[PDB]
Ligand binder design. Structure first.
Ligand code: GDP
Ligand code: ZN
Length: 274
């Protein structure tokens, strides 16, 4: 016995079994057919019913969020995420370095980012010279940025709007309010939840620690939008972009098409990779 084929999305992964939600808005547990590739939360599948179903086939993923293995290798932990929400705050102090890192991860994963200044209620006149400075570094790169407070409620209906129609992941250093933010947007391994205003979320303590490990220099360079356009124009195809004339990047910095705050963390980060 097996009912007809159906289209659905993966909600939870209970090892041998998988929680699956359909377009109808109904949930069912489905066993995993043997031949089937590895599945993660967010994946789109074909299944048949029987209250237990059988997952028959996996539909292509649009995107993948990976995470380091027990060994140290990257294995996917979520699928079909189209937005990564990078959350920082006035406290603890935000550094360009870690932000520039999460921005690279988002590029490596092939997923569009969205920066979030949480704890905007803590933006004193004292902080603003230092804060508006850093915000407008990513504002002038074309990146989406919102200033919010999961304490106040400041600009939360814009975030709910920014999250509408997307599948989103919440990522940032600990203590910026990731838990507080989820709870504010959802009052009551990777699991998938739906925002009441619209859009979905995939969450787990492991995905929250999602960031950047060791990669290639050419990966890192691709993580800088200013860079992507120029790379391959430095005359020296062997250019290291350091004291080298004919370095397109260098000329760009001079002209102001690269910001020194960025050209710095590029050096700091690349020199952290082996
Ligand atoms: N002042 C202020 N504090 C906040 C805000 N959002 C979160 N917090 C505080 O930040 C601290 C850490 O929050 P939490 O969600 O646990 O951070 P997480 O480690 O990133 O999940 C908590 O004590 C919260 O009260 C905010 O908008 N304003
Ligand atoms: Zn160069």
């Amino acid at each position: 016995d097996l009912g007809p084929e159906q289209t659905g999305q993966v909600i939870a992964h209970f090892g041998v079994q998988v929680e699956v939600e359909s377009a109808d808005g109904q949930v069912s547990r489905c066993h995993l057919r043997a031949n089937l590739p590895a599945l993660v939360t967010g994946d789109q599948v074909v299944w048949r019913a029987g209250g237990i179903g059988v997952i028959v086939a996996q539909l292509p993923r649009r995107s993948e969020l990976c995470r380091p293995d027990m060994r140290g290798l990257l294995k996917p932990v979520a699928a079909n995420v189209d937005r990564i929400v990078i959350v920082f705050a006035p406290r603890p102090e935000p550094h360009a370095n870690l932000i520039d890192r999460y921005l690279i991860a988002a590029e490596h994963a092939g997923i569009q980012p969205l920066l979030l200044l949480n704890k905007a209620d803590l933006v004193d006149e004292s902080n603003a010279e230092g804060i508006d400075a850093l915000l407008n570094v990513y504002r002038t790169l074309g990146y989406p940025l919102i200033e919010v407070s999961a304490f106040n409620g400041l600009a939360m209906d814009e975030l709910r709007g920014a999250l509408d129609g997307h599948v989103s992941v919440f990522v940032g250093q600990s203590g910026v309010g990731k838990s507080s933010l989820v709870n504010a947007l959802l009052p009551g391994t990777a699991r998938l939840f739906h925002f009441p205003g619209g859009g979905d979320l995939i969450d787990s303590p492991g995905i929250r620690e999602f960031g950047l490990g060791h990669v290639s220099r050419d990966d890192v360079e691709a993580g800088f939008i200013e860079f992507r356009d120029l790379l391959g124009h430095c005359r020296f195809r062997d250019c290291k972009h350091d004291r080298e004339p004919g370095c397109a990047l260098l000329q760009a910095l001079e002209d102001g098409r690269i910001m020194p705050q960025r050209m710095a963390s590029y050096r700091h980060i690349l020199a952290s990779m082996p």
